[PDB]
Amino acid sequence: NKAISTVEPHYEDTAPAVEPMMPGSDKTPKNRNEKLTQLDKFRFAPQGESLRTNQGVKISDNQNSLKSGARGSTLLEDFILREKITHFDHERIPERVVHARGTGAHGYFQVYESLASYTTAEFLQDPSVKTPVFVRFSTVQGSRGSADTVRDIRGWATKFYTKEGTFDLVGNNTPVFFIQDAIKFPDFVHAVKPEPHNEIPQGQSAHDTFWDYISLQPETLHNVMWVMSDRGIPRSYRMMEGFGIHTYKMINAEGQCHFIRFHWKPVYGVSSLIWDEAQLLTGCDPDFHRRELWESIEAGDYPEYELGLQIIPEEDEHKFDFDILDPTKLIPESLVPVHLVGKMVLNRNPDNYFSETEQVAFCPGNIVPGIDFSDDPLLQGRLFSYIDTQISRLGGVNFHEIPINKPICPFHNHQRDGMHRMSISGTANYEPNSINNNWPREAPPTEGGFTTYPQPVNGYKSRKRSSTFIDFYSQPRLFWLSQTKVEQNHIVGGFSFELGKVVRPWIRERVVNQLTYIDHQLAQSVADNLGIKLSQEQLKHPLPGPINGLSKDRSLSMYDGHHQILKSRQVAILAADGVCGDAIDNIMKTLKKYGVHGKIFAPHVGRITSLQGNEIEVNGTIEGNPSVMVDAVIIPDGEDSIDSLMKNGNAKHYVIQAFKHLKAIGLQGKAFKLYDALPLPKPDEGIVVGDKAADLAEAFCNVMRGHRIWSRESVAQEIAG
Taking CB under 6 A as the criterion, which residues in 129-168 touch ligand HEM? 136, 138, 155-157
The Cα 100–Cα 274 span in angstroms is: 24
Confirm if 250 and 182 have CB atoms less than 8 A apart: no
**Ranges within 554-593 binding a copy of itself (CB under 8 A):** none
What are residue 574's phi and psi, to 5 degrees? -90, 115
Q: Judged by CB, which is closer to a copy of itself: 256, or 466?
A: 466
Helix (H), strand (E) at residue 282: helix 275-284
Q: How many residues bind a copy of itself (CB under 8 A)?
A: 303
Confirm if 294 and 356 have CB atoms less than 8 A apart: no
**Contact pattern for a copy of itself over residues 17 through 36, marking x by CB under 8 A:** -xxxxxxxxx----------
Confirm if 98 and 189 have CB atoms less than 8 A apart: yes
| Backbone gaps in the chain, preceding residues (C–N over 2.5 A) | 17
Q: Does 526 bind ligand HEM (CB under 6 A)?
A: no
Q: Which residue in the set 30, 461, 540, 682 belongs to the binding site for a copy of itself (CB under 8 A)? A: 461
Using the CB atoms, write b or e for 568-579: b if 16+ within 10 Å.
bbbbbbbbbbbb
Q: Judged by CB, which is closer to a copy of itself: 248, or 700?
A: 248
Q: Judged by CB, which is closer to ligand HEM: 141, or 215?
A: 141
In the list a copy of itself, ligand HEM, none, the entry touching 621 (Cβ below 5 to 8 angstroms by class) is a copy of itself
Q: Judged by CB, which is closer to ligand HEM: 113, or 375?
A: 375
Q: Judged by CB, which is closer to a copy of itself: 528, or 640?
A: 528
Burial of residue 259 (CB within 10 Å: 0-12, 13-18, 19+) is buried
Q: Does 102 bind ligand HEM (CB under 6 A)?
A: yes
Q: Judged by CB, which is closer to ligand HEM: 133, or 622?
A: 133
Q: Judged by CB, which is closer to ligand HEM: 159, or 597?
A: 159
Closest CA to 531 of 556, 553, 500: 500
How is residue 20 annotated by DSSP? Answer: P
In the list a copy of itself, ligand HEM, none, the entry touching 171 (Cβ below 5 to 8 angstroms by class) is ligand HEM
Q: Which residue in the set 53, 114, 256, 551 belongs to the binding site for a copy of itself (CB under 8 A)? A: 53
Q: Strand pairing partners for 666?
A: 634, 688
Q: Which residue in the set 156, 178, 213, 237 belongs to the binding site for a copy of itself (CB under 8 A)? A: 213
Q: Judged by CB, which is closer to a copy of itself: 276, or 304?
A: 276
CB of 616 to a copy of itself, least distance (A): 11
Q: Which residue in the set 299, 340, 419, 715 belongs to the binding site for a copy of itself (CB under 8 A)? A: 419
The Cα 175–Cα 159 span in angstroms is: 19
Q: DSSP assignment of 173-241, as one string?
A: SSSS-S-SSGGGHHHHHHHHSPPTTT---TT---SHHHHHHHHH-GGGHHHHHHHHSGGGSBS-GGGS-
Q: Strand pairing partners for 572?
A: 599, 633
Q: Which residues are the active-site residues?
A: 99, 172
CA-to-CA dists, residue 369 to 44, 159, 699, angstroms: 36, 15, 53
**Contact pattern for a copy of itself over residues 326 through 365, marking x by CB under 8 A:** -----------------------xxxxxxxxxxx-----x
How is residue 51 annotated by DSSP? Answer: P
**Contact pattern for ligand HEM over residues 173 through 212, marking x by CB under 6 A:** ----x----x--x---------------------------
**Ranges within 222-261 binding ligand HEM (CB under 6 A):** 245-246
The Cα 339–Cα 269 span in angstroms is: 17
Q: Report the largest interatomic distance among the alpha carbons of the chain, rounded to a whole angstrom.
A: 90
**Ranges within 135-154 binding a copy of itself (CB under 8 A):** 142-147, 151
The Cα 37–Cα 659 span in angstroms is: 48
Q: Judged by CB, which is closer to ligand HEM: 85, or 253?
A: 85
**Ranges within 653-712 binding a copy of itself (CB under 8 A):** none
Q: Judged by CB, which is closer to a copy of itself: 463, or 682?
A: 463
Q: Which residue in the set 57, 59, 85, 299 belongs to the binding site for ligand HEM (CB under 6 A)? A: 85
**Ranges within 366-385 binding a copy of itself (CB under 8 A):** 366-369, 373, 375, 377, 380-381, 383-385
CB of 504 to a copy of itself, least distance (A): 5
**Ranges within 156-175 binding a copy of itself (CB under 8 A):** 162, 164-166
Torsion angle of alpha carbons 554, 557, 558, 562, nearest 10°? 0
In the list ligand HEM, a copy of itself, none, the entry touching 299 (Cβ below 5 to 8 angstroms by class) is none
Residues 380, 381, 386, 392: is their CA dihedral positive or negative?
Answer: positive
CB of 388 to ligand HEM, least distance (A): 8
Q: How many residues bind ligand HEM (CB under 6 A)?
A: 31
**Ranges within 54-73 binding a copy of itself (CB under 8 A):** 54-73
Using the CB atoms, write b or e for 370-399: b if 16+ within 10 Å.
bbbbbebbbbbbbbebbeebbeebbbebbb
In the list ligand HEM, a copy of itself, none, the entry touching 127 (Cβ below 5 to 8 angstroms by class) is none
Distance of CA 469 to the CA centre of its chain: 29
**Ranges within 308-337 binding ligand HEM (CB under 6 A):** 327
Q: Which residue in the set 109, 123, 137, 188 belongs to the binding site for a copy of itself (CB under 8 A)? A: 188
Stretch that binds a copy of itself, among 125-133, 389-397, 678-686, 690-698 (CB under 8 A): 389-397
In angstroms, what is the C-alpha Rg of the chain? 29
Q: Does 91 bind ligand HEM (CB under 6 A)?
A: no
Residues for the chain: how many in total?
Answer: 721
The Cα 100–Cα 592 span in angstroms is: 36
Helix (H), strand (E) at residue 87: helix 79-89
Q: Strand pairing partners for 378?
A: none
Nearest 5°: the CA angle 44, 47, 53 is 65
Q: Does 386 bind ligand HEM (CB under 6 A)?
A: yes
CA-to-CA dists, residue 340 to 114, 263, 279, 323, angstroms: 12, 9, 35, 24
Q: Which residue in the set 128, 444, 549, 682 belongs to the binding site for a copy of itself (CB under 8 A)? A: 444
In the list a copy of itself, ligand HEM, none, the entry touching 136 (Cβ below 5 to 8 angstroms by class) is ligand HEM
Torsion angle of alpha carbons 172, 178, 184, 188, nearest 10°? -90
Stretch that binds a copy of itself, among 327-335, 340-348, 396-404, 710-718 (CB under 8 A): 396-404
Residues 438, 443, 449, 450: is their CA dihedral positive or negative?
Answer: positive
Which residue is closest to ligand HEM by CB?
A: 155
**Contact pattern for a copy of itself over residues 609 through 648, marking x by CB under 8 A:** ---------x-xx-xx------------------------
Q: Which residue in the set 337, 440, 595, 690 belongs to the binding site for a copy of itself (CB under 8 A)? A: 440
Q: How far apart are the two ends of the chain, measured CA to CA in Å?
A: 54
**Contact pattern for ligand HEM over residues 361 through 380, marking x by CB under 6 A:** xx---------------x--
Q: Does 171 bind ligand HEM (CB under 6 A)?
A: yes
Which residues lie near ligand HEM (CB under 6 A)?
85, 89, 96-99, 102, 136, 138, 155-157, 170-172, 177, 182, 185, 245-246, 327, 361-362, 378, 381-382, 385-386, 389-390, 393
